[PDB]
Design a protein around this ligand. Sequence first.
Ligand code: HEM
Length: 291
Amino acid sequence: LVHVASVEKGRSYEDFQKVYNAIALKLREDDEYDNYIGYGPVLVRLAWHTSGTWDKHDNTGGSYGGTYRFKKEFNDPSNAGLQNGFKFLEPIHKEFPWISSGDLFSLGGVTAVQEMQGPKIPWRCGRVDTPEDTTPDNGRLPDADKDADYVRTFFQRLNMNDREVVALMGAHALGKTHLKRSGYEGPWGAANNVFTNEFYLNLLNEDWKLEKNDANNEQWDSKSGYMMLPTDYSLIQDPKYLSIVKEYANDQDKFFKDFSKAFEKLLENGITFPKDAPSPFIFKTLEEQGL
Ligand code: HEM
């Protein structure tokens, strides 16, 4: 199936900047969530999980249809906790009922990255809600207890190469693992609601110990109180990934640029943009607007 981007009728950049802004203002206001981490990280994860169901082989899943709103997908065990991001977005959707669900989930992630001082992420509108029976089955999102070969093979299905995978994984600077959600516990670093290249620096520079958590799963832990999943640690066990980790640990701008591209790509898999579609939008942050 072909999913053609269809601009919400009559809307243009200013309409979407208003949605951006409402998201950004609520991010600022609702600051208590998750022991004052705020909603930034879970909104980034929501954007990724709503996009990451995509299968390049048949164009099933992906961000276009906004299918997370249906119970099979919002109840995927892999999505445990993302209901917090959905509930955050609910008043946004009520204020702007014209935006599609896929456009809102993906825009939430863009807005979160940018408001957390991350790179600009160009964003295109035009996702169209699709019916309940187009919801992908559970099991398309990745396991965390696996090795580099797993990660590499997994991400081929999303048409991501080694550099794109290592870049995307840098989002694990953000937020934390929660035991009751994923069976893993702990943050990956100190700056977990500011978008930086800290994930790579911590992988290379902390002294990691392979421990079992209270859910009896193995994870890598440091004396600073940080953790890495087995799939995170695989990025320094595999020599191809390791080279790229070192690159991003040593060049914040390069990480920003490569993340931006990869994240936009992730959010746009499966969508066909007509030749006369609008160019991608680059939203101004609240700070840049003086708001
Ligand atoms: C091999 C791939 C990946 C695996 C196995 C993985 C696994 C996980 C797990 C287990 C959690 C903790 C969930 C919890 O307990 O709350 C998590 C959190 C998170 N992941 Fe991933 N992840 C992967 C890729 C990505 C990518 C590609 C992004 C986005 C670009 C991403 C963004 C996030 C964010 C932002 C959080 C924190 C959520 C929060 O604090 O609520 N992850 N991931």
